[PDB]
Design a protein around this ligand. Sequence first.
Ligand SMILES: [Cl-]
Ligand SMILES: [Cl-]
Ligand SMILES: [Cl-]
Ligand SMILES: [Cl-]
Ligand SMILES: [Cl-]
Ligand SMILES: [Cl-]
Ligand SMILES: [Cl-]
Ligand SMILES: [Cl-]
Ligand SMILES: [Cl-]
Ligand SMILES: [Cl-]
Ligand SMILES: [K+]
Ligand SMILES: [K+]
Ligand SMILES: [K+]
Ligand SMILES: [K+]
Ligand SMILES: [K+]
Ligand SMILES: [K+]
Ligand SMILES: [K+]
Ligand SMILES: [K+]
Ligand SMILES: [K+]
Ligand SMILES: [K+]
Ligand SMILES: [K+]
Ligand SMILES: [K+]
Ligand SMILES: [Mg+2]
Ligand SMILES: [Mg+2]
Ligand SMILES: [Mg+2]
Lengths: 349, 349, 349
Amino acid sequence: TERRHDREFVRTFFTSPTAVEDDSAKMLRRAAGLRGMQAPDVWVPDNEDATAPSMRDEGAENIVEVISEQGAEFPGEIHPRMVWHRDSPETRYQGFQHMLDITDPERGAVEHIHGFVIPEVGGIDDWKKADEFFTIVEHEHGLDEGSLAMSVIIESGEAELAMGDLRDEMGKPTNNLERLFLLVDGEVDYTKDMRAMTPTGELPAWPELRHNTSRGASAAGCVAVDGPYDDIRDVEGYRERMTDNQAKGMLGIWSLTPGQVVEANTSPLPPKTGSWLLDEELLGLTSYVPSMDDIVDSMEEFEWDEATYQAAMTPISLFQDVYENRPDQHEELEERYGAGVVERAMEVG
Amino acid sequence: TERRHDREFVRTFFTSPTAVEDDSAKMLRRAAGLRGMQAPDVWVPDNEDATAPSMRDEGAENIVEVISEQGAEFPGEIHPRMVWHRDSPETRYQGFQHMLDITDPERGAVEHIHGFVIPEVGGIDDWKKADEFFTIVEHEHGLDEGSLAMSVIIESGEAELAMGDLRDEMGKPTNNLERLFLLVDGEVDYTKDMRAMTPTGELPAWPELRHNTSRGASAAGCVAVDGPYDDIRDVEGYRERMTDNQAKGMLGIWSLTPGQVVEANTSPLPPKTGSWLLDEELLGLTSYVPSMDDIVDSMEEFEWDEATYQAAMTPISLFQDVYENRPDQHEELEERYGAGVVERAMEVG
Amino acid sequence: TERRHDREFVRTFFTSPTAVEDDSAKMLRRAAGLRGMQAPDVWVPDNEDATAPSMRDEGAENIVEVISEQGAEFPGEIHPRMVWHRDSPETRYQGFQHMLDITDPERGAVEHIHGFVIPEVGGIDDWKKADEFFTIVEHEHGLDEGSLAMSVIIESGEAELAMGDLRDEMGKPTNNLERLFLLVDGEVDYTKDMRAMTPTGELPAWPELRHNTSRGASAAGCVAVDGPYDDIRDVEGYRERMTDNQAKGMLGIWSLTPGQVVEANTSPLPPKTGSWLLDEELLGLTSYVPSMDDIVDSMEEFEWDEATYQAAMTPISLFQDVYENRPDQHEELEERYGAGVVERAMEVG
Ligand SMILES: [Cl-]
Ligand SMILES: [Cl-]
Ligand SMILES: [Cl-]
Ligand SMILES: [Cl-]
Ligand SMILES: [Cl-]
Ligand SMILES: [Cl-]
Ligand SMILES: [Cl-]
Ligand SMILES: [Cl-]
Ligand SMILES: [Cl-]
Ligand SMILES: [Cl-]
Ligand SMILES: [K+]
Ligand SMILES: [K+]
Ligand SMILES: [K+]
Ligand SMILES: [K+]
Ligand SMILES: [K+]
Ligand SMILES: [K+]
Ligand SMILES: [K+]
Ligand SMILES: [K+]
Ligand SMILES: [K+]
Ligand SMILES: [K+]
Ligand SMILES: [K+]
Ligand SMILES: [K+]
Ligand SMILES: [Mg+2]
Ligand SMILES: [Mg+2]
Ligand SMILES: [Mg+2]
């Protein structure tokens, strides 16, 4: 099975906020200035999670201003991320509308744009809705069919499975799914969707998701990439995961800073020298396990970005479900958290 | 994707024998008396594996006697387990017949019954046979369509795969598979079906089965639960697995005793206090590896419940297959087990 | 689900070159002399990877000469491996042609041949092409339909997935896929196909591939087997993997030497004695990590069999992709490898 895109491999997939609460295109203009090993193979001005939602309409204008003035020199491929969601026609329509604004050829961005990145997709028929949107945007703006590459973030159970019959869905003459380019794991939301929880709240490793995504990319002629690694300071951990991914055939990974771009650009390359193997630094050695109360102070005082919120919303949710349906447990639950904490936890949206 | 059931989460799935070889409803009457943290979110009077087969017709009567007299006060949901098997129309018919007896509304049980648990299912079309049985039972007894929740034990290769296209099978207008509620791993029989074997005979961990089941529950709007943890004394191991499951998004687990119900009810809840992390007790420290002879003494003298039998039937089976088809090996096999052990092992049903 | 073949289990799957660059049937004639624990349950004269390609037409004649003169006494089942490839009609046609030569009943081999082993298969419709070839070979040579067992090496992403709907594909009246017997992992080429890479170049472990293959064999009534373990000297490692496989329900494994046949024949059998568990030898303790330069000396001087070549072709390929598309990185890449190494690496076919 063969890849349909100019980039046979992609080591770095680097996101930037598109409009910050100054010159709101700040992050974009600098990220566009990156050259050499500090530049990602793929650059993602991110109008989705990186960007506060009320900044999002401005983000799309900034995407057009910055790629307009500066896209031409940017050495990698550019693929901004739209909003989208398998469960939310308004979000779908929003993403398509931004996509349509961004690509108006009279504005100078489109010709430096290689494609777009569609977060939160569902089952294959949700992928077909996005693909249909790309087809329409292309037609409205005299671009060639298939020229906008679509890449998807795999971040629900449904989308992990959808990778299974992609080879044959993709060849139906009623979609243009050949446009698929990257299959990008999104451990953060995948964790929410799967209702998983860890005692520290660090992402579970999901080796099977990563296998499944490497498999799907290989069987369908796409390129697999792994998702953000948030602990930016933990250079060793980031290299350890990239090495683990490389043993899955997942060869690119998300980068969050220009230092991550450098680690990421370098890791899959063979080392300079040979090597022989044998049979406040304290912070990178400490992980905290929050208490019910910790988590409810924290949430309470959040009203940490969205994703820290939703992550903890799980044990709290399991708590609320339990509280709502187990009167018989009401007493022992209180005898264990204090009556104050309990009806405080009950209050978390 | 959304859950169709009153219980958004289920931490404990607790089984009890329905008729023991006294008052044979003993186990049921006491388990029905459980309140607070000793009570499971889901209670499973088990007319299948917990119960000797010749006690099974009596079990179904006891299910009706006990839930009749006592169901009304039971604080969790009640879901008795029927017999069933993808390979055995008699078993299927038996399960449906017990189901039909149990729900006669003139008997007082049905109104405290939330649904049933169907063991040993196969490919999705085997799930449709069970669902058809629920539909018919409902109609015969003026219950509302879909009101009996069906939960399945995932304990064959076929049923692990069947979870893959569930979202779309479930929406066909010819089944009522929306009734699905729990997807419950059954490591014990899954191990038999997959012909796996371990040197101690302890269950392999099957992280992928558990991933696959969390994924399937999330993509189809069901709740994932893990299977019995037999080493009841190994409190640490049970918490270690529940924690491992929780990192898969598998949040409930089977409980075999009221102490397991307590561990299980407590584990997925956030801890009371914060915690900081840094980079004849002898029996819980010893595992025996049986010898061919051990295993044949043991089996021989069994003629350990069913499942210990079937588990060891695997290496013995591989032995018999080998013996039947490799005359050239007959000599070295004997020179290694003794001629006595060999034709003794050859005799194991 | 039930197995359709004489051998319910298969512990050893042993390959031999069919024609070596003397008497080119050497390897075959001796391997055919093996008896007892040194004999595999399944013997694979290998006209594919074991054999240089220009020796392949001679291999097929040797298969007929040796099985002719000696097949009758060989105590296991015999299943030679043909060439094949999901991407290469010439290879497919070649495999079928050798298969057709081999089975001419006037030549004495066919009656000691149990079936054939088809490497490199793709999606299920590629399996149907091979099956069609078996059907035709059978008909041309008055053999009974279905009497040649087909076994496949699982060594692409596509073929791992193809195992998913096998139970139902297999029952269509337009193929004879009941003939399926073994599902054999091929970690070596699977690693290429998935574009995985390890720092030592040792095969990644691919537990999920192995799970998926045990699952597929169980759901479809085939027997799962694992792929070659190249480090022939590492007896401990080979037993450790076989034990790991056995916990997946993968009970046979590839053997490369008569000593591996002996380990392999013995490992899944229960131990002789009980056992109690508690809570230049230097070479088997050293692994080398090659440098870019190492890998390019090595490749350069290869123009190590095919598979060592293709394996390293991955980081080199990722290097070339990067070099071709990242001018901005050209300077730092050189400042790190030397300008000599770089345009030398650029030259690797
Ligand atoms: Cl929707
Ligand atoms: Cl984890
Ligand atoms: Cl899978
Ligand atoms: Cl890839
Ligand atoms: Cl049946
Ligand atoms: Cl294990
Ligand atoms: Cl769940
Ligand atoms: Cl082809
Ligand atoms: Cl590995
Ligand atoms: Cl098997
Ligand atoms: K999101
Ligand atoms: K298409
Ligand atoms: K089209
Ligand atoms: K891959
Ligand atoms: K059973
Ligand atoms: K339905
Ligand atoms: K219906
Ligand atoms: K889940
Ligand atoms: K090959
Ligand atoms: K067929
Ligand atoms: K047929
Ligand atoms: K198996
Ligand atoms: Mg996300
Ligand atoms: Mg069972
Ligand atoms: Mg191969």
